[PDB]
Amino acid sequence: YKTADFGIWERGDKTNQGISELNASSVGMAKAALEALDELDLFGVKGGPQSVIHVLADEVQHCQSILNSLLPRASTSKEVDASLLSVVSFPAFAVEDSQLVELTKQEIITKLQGRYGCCRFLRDGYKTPKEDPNRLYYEPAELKLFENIECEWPLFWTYFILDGVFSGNAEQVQEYKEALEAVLIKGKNGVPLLPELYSVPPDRVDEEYQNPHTVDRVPMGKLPHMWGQSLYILGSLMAEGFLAPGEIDPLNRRFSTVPKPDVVVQVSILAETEEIKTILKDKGIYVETIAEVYPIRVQPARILSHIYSSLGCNNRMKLSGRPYRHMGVLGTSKLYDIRKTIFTFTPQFIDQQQFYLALDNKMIVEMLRTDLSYLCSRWRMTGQPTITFPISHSMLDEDGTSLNSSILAALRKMQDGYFGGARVQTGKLSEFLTTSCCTHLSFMDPEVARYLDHLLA
Amino acid sequence: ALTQLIDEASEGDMSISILTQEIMVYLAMYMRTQPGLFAEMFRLRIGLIIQVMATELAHSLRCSAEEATEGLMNLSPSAMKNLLHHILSGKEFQGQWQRRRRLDGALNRVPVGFYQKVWKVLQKCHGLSVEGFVLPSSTTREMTPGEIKFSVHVESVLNRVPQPEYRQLLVEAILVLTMLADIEIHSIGSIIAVEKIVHIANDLFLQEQKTLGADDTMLAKDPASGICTLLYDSAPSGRFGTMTYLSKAAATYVQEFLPHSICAMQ
Amino acid sequence: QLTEEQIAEFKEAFSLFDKDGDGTITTKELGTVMRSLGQNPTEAELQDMINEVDADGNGTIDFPEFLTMMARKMKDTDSEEEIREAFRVFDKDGNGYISAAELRHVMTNLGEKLTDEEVDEMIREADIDGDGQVNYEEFVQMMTA
Amino acid sequence: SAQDFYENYEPKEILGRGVSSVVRRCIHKPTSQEYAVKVIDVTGGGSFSPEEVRELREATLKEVDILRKVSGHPNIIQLKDTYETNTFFFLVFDLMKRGELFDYLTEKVTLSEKETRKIMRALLEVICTLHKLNIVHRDLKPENILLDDNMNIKLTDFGFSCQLEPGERLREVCGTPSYLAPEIIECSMNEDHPGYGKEVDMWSTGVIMYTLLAGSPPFWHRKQMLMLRMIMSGNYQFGSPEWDDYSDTVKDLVSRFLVVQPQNRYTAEEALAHPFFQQYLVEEVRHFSPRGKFKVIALTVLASVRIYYQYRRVKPVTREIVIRDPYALRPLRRLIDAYAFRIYGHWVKKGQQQNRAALFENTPKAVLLSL
Ligand SMILES: C/C=C(\C)CC/C=C(\C)CCC=C(C)C
Numbered sequence A: 001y002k003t004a005d006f007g008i009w010e011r012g013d014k015t016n017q018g019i020s021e022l023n024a025s026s027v028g029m030a031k032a033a034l035e036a037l038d039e040l041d042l043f044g045v046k047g048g049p050q051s052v053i054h055v056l057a058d059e060v061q062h063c064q065s066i067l068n069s070l071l072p073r074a075s076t077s078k079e080v081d082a083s084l085l086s087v088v089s090f091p092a093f094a095v096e097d098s099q100l101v102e103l104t105k106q107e108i109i110t111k112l113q114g115r116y117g118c119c120r121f122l123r124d125g126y127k128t129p130k131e132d133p134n135r136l137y138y139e140p141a142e143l144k145l146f147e148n149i150e151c152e153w154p155l156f157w158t159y160f161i162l163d164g165v166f167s168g169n170a171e172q173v174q175e176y177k178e179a180l181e182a183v184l185i186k187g188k189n190g191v192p193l194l195p196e197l198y199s200v201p202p203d204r205v206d207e208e209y210q211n212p213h214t215v216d217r218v219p220m221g222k223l224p225h226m227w228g229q230s231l232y233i234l235g236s237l238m239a240e241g242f243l244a245p246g247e248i249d250p251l252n253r254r255f256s257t258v259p260k261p262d263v264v265v266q267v268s269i270l271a272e273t274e275e276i277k278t279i280l281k282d283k284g285i286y287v288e289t290i291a292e293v294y295p296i297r298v299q300p301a302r303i304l305s306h307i308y309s310s311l312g313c314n315n316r317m318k319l320s321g322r323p324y325r326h327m328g329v330l331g332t333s334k335l336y337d338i339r340k341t342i343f344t345f346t347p348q349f350i351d352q353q354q355f356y357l358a359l360d361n362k363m364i365v366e367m368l369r370t371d372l373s374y375l376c377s378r379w380r381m382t383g384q385p386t387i388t389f390p391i392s393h394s395m396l397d398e399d400g401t402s403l404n405s406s407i408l409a410a411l412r413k414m415q416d417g418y419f420g421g422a423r424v425q426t427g428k429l430s431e432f433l434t435t436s437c438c439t440h441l442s443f444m445d446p447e448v449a450r451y452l453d454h455l456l457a
Numbered sequence B: 001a002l003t004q005l006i007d008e009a010s011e012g013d014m015s016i017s018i019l020t021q022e023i024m025v026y027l028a029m030y031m032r033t034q035p036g037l038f039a040e041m042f043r044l045r046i047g048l049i050i051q052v053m054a055t056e057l058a059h060s061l062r063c064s065a066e067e068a069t070e071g072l073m074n075l076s077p078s079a080m081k082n083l084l085h086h087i088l089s090g091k092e093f094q095g096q097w098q099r100r101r102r103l104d105g106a107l108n109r110v111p112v113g114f115y116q117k118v119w120k121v122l123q124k125c126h127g128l129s130v131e132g133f134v135l136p137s138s139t140t141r142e143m144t145p146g147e148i149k150f151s152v153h154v155e156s157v158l159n160r161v162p163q164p165e166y167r168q169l170l171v172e173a174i175l176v177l178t179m180l181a182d183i184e185i186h187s188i189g190s191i192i193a194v195e196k197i198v199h200i201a202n203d204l205f206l207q208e209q210k211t212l213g214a215d216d217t218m219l220a221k222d223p224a225s226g227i228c229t230l231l232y233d234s235a236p237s238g239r240f241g242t243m244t245y246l247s248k249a250a251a252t253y254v255q256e257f258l259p260h261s262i263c264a265m266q
Numbered sequence C: 001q002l003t004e005e006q007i008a009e010f011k012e013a014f015s016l017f018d019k020d021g022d023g024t025i026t027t028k029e030l031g032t033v034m035r036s037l038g039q040n041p042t043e044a045e046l047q048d049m050i051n052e053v054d055a056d057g058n059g060t061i062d063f064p065e066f067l068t069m070m071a072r073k074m075k076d077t078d079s080e081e082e083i084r085e086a087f088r089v090f091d092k093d094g095n096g097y098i099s100a101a102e103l104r105h106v107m108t109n110l111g112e113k114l115t116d117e118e119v120d121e122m123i124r125e126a127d128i129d130g131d132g133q134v135n136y137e138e139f140v141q142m143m144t145a
Numbered sequence D: 001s002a003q004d005f006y007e008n009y010e011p012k013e014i015l016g017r018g019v020s021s022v023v024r025r026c027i028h029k030p031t032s033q034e035y036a037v038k039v040i041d042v043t044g045g046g047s048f049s050p051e052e053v054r055e056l057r058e059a060t061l062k063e064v065d066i067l068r069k070v071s072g073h074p075n076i077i078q079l080k081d082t083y084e085t086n087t088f089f090f091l092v093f094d095l096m097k098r099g100e101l102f103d104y105l106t107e108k109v110t111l112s113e114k115e116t117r118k119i120m121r122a123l124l125e126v127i128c129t130l131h132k133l134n135i136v137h138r139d140l141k142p143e144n145i146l147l148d149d150n151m152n153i154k155l156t157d158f159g160f161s162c163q164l165e166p167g168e169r170l171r172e173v174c175g176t177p178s179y180l181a182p183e184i185i186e187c188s189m190n191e192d193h194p195g196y197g198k199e200v201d202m203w204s205t206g207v208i209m210y211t212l213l214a215g216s217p218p219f220w221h222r223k224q225m226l227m228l229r230m231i232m233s234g235n236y237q238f239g240s241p242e243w244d245d246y247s248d249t250v251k252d253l254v255s256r257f258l259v260v261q262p263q264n265r266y267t268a269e270e271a272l273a274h275p276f277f278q279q280y281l282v283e284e285v286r287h288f289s290p291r292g293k294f295k296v297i298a299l300t301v302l303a304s305v306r307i308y309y310q311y312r313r314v315k316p317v318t319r320e321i322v323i324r325d326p327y328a329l330r331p332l333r334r335l336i337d338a339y340a341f342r343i344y345g346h347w348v349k350k351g352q353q354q355n356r357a358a359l360f361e362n363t364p365k366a367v368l369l370s371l
Helices: A024-036 A057-070 A082-088 A098-111 A140-146 A155-167 A170-181 A205-210 A226-239 A274-282 A301-307 A361-377 A405-416 A448-456 B002-010 B014-033 B046-059 B065-072 B077-089 B096-101 B114-122 B137-142 B148-158 B165-183 B194-212 B229-233 B242-257 C004-017 C027-036 C043-054 C063-070 C076-090 C100-109 C116-126 C136-144 D002-006 D050-069 D101-107 D113-132 D182-189 D200-214 D224-233 D248-258 D290-313 D319-324 D330-343
Strands: A185-187 A191-193 A197-199 A218-220 A264-271 A297-300 A335-338 A341-346 A386-391 A422-426 B127-129 B191-193 D009-016 D021-028 D033-041 D081-084 D088-094 D145-147 D153-155
Touching (some): A024 A057, A140 B137, A155 A170, A155 A226, A170 A226, A264 A405, A297 A301, A341 A386, A361 A386, A361 A405, A361 B014, B096 B165, B114 B137, B148 B165, B165 D330, B191 B242, B194 B242, B242 D319, B242 D330, C004 C027, C004 C063, C027 C043, C027 D290, C063 D290, C100 D290, C136 D290, D002 D081, D113 D153, D200 D248
Parallel strands (some): A264 A386, A264 A422, A297 A341, B127 B191
Antiparallel strands (some): A197 A218, D009 D021, D021 D033, D081 D088, D145 D153
């Protein structure tokens, strides 16, 4: 989601100059895989804790946010790419809002569809007659020569078959099937072969400039195109009732676009010291000290990030595990069981060592508001998120005998049930043990391990 | 790479780098909360955001630029957030519009479709030059109206003027050119100098106010650009507004290049 | 300040304009009227004409917009020209006297069937100076009244 | 309780913001019907002292009352039900997909005569209902006016309203400065004036007329008290070139609401009786004396002749008239205003230092800098 890549068409941006860009298809497929590989035992039913592939939903939701910002655009340099058909419906199912799905789909069929297939993107010029077949890159002025003459791949009409059969909107499956069967070329003993691309004849280029998507196109490029052939055969198998949506998608990615209700956030407001607990008690709030939370142990998000660096570490393969990355609200909203000990990690927005934004109590209230709202909008687990919020001396007043007015108001809002667009069910951390996403960190069981067993002992 | 780029752009100015990353975070959850605060602003210039921050914290609680930065780097993070919200949404705590054009041409804010409207006008011309820096229609055929590279080219032509306010005056002149081109059937077929359009608008403003009784003291030129400070403080619309004088000079300039003109559809 | 009467006069005028009881006067309808009164402009002209009055209205005039026009927005010169024009519209003869028959000529044109004596009466009611003729001076005096 | 709130509605997205109140869209689970919820922070982030915390509740408890007293009426929102907590006060009402009239007046700088007529036809008919029930608003600003997808007016924020006891006249100053009637300030600057009654709403409505049809408040200037002397004295002008292209029936009705003396103000019932809001009912006999018939046929002729004459008069846009005076003629002036609000439509906000008149300069700089 934060890395730029050459993308599905191995060319980066529209200029085709080796400039990698954040194309939406890569991020969406990344989200689809990450949502696919979560808590998935990778020997299958004959498996155990050692084969669970662990995916942090923080990166998944960042991917979703970046697609939401991107869609219907595929990249900053491209207003829309047909490769978003690999993201909106299938295989990815990486977009949860159906409105964006249809908006992208009509943008595509309006701007990129022709009568021989869908162009990859505007000003593509991958195999147009107005391109030198030797120079791998494109000059900037050369891009304008590809307008209205881009090559149309029938590959993506098979994609429109796939999304049509997955959705169950038969018209589409009929109209686009008759669209695709008229561009298939027969081969061998008469078998349909789908050309990779239909190219403009060099003499009809001007006519298509004046009237786009009107000329007869010739089959050019790789034939048969086994990506397009595979998608066409999959669609034809389903379309005639030999395959089912469940068979192709056991994980049920086809239910990403269905509505999902918001969740009730559990919050365990904690007190660093007994005197902090007494000050908050005088204000009519019921909180438990971080010492009374024992045997449940509370740690900052940096400790969770260090712990999560020990996944997939295999010395002979010379893999050091996950790189040190910040844990968002979701990673810190789940109760982790490590070495049979329940562990609740505080959200990173209260960390004052990394930055001073957590030294400002109004900023504390503001980013708690933002995190709670976003996590309510983006929780996709089993159970209920649980944020442990410890009250420190920095969250008191300058006098030291009173909690800050902003934090007092915020805590009262969470106790009453509403704060910042979120429904908060406050309570003790012990009560939320059975009503949360209890993820067992199986990778640690026989650096950070020494720190952990020091805390446990 | 991001941290190294920020530090290198700081050029040893640690304070501007740390304020830069903090303002990046603020811009980030402002995107996540209120995307509409950035519809007019396509390039997010955190350094110029800090500079405008200091300028606005100087205009209120009147003090020097050094004292402005000293105060700026002193407030609480929530104060950074609310002040940035003020500068972005347009909330207000030389003159009113002179502080509304110094805050509009320094962040390089242009109305929605400005980069999409320059494209249409350039097809009726040969180029758009600001301070002798042309933006020809070859760019329009090169890059689409909605292309980000087109916005980059237009702002590169529009950022050739160092000061903020006369840049927004140039933007207003460009847009009155757009509207007059919509009215005008014919095309100029040549280069139009937006800077000289604003200069002729300033001359017309001077003449009209001098006839109506304005003294030389009020009719005072800006030291660098040469546009009168009152014209900077003048309201955009109105009988004597900036966008009426720019609509007055976007016609007398087209006079020499276009000997005969036909205006239709009102 | 337009009296219940005046508003009512504007309303019946709006009625004379629309044959259909549409509640609106179309570019075509105005036209039927102008041609009824003999000065028949182009269909385009009409479109512009209905546009000058409304600006949205899709080529149809409304009573709030028609009163809006019939209220004396007119400048003395502007009205004068108009007052004069109607008067001419009144006299095909252009003799300069308003024939009883002529009033009939106009009504017949506007498709309203009204009694012959009544017509004489209409002039007579309003006629002192021109026995049988409304002089222009009478017309102007009358309009203001 | 908050459970009662979420048992019936689910807030999806943030619609608008306020000083301490937040407007949020919701879905009514039993009905799946769009509804707006205003979410007032009672504690206000801790800035509110216990007095303001109490006062905001009493203001809110009162606020339910007026919105309870008026219901089923076409052009004011229906408070479907109200939920109160120790820290918030939720109020669920109708969803208006479009924003306030201020946002609309920003998009279209000068609002056309036909459009404003039904806009205020509702507003005056709104005003009749309030006055017949004897409830004054004191807050009739266009930001207080909400519009739906059919442009229908939904008067909102009766936050400053209070029910007059029969024959009682208030003294508290409630309202942002521009839209305050002359005796509002006079009662603020004197004790002899025993108060202002329900005629207050008439002045505020007449102010919308000048704002909607011209894009500026009737009286506006950047310092605070100077606006006030323009209000109590009552110095307004249908200035040129702006205000000359509208029909004369507009001007008189504007003055009627804008008379400085309250008793001579144009109350809501007779306000709808002014010639502007007269409607063409098809089925009217409309009998007339023979002089009355003769006028109609003459007026019918005079109207056709008029329309041809008025149109012939409109001057096509030429190069020279643009050079001499753009603002003088309508098509170019409305354009300059339109592209005025596209560039600096973000500068116009609620208050005094952000009004729309800041975007108009109708006077020479010398007369502006005279004092
Ligand atoms: C109707 C406007 C006029 C007399 C003023 C002169 C207009 C122009 C000089 C050129 C601006 C844009 C052109 C796009 C093609």
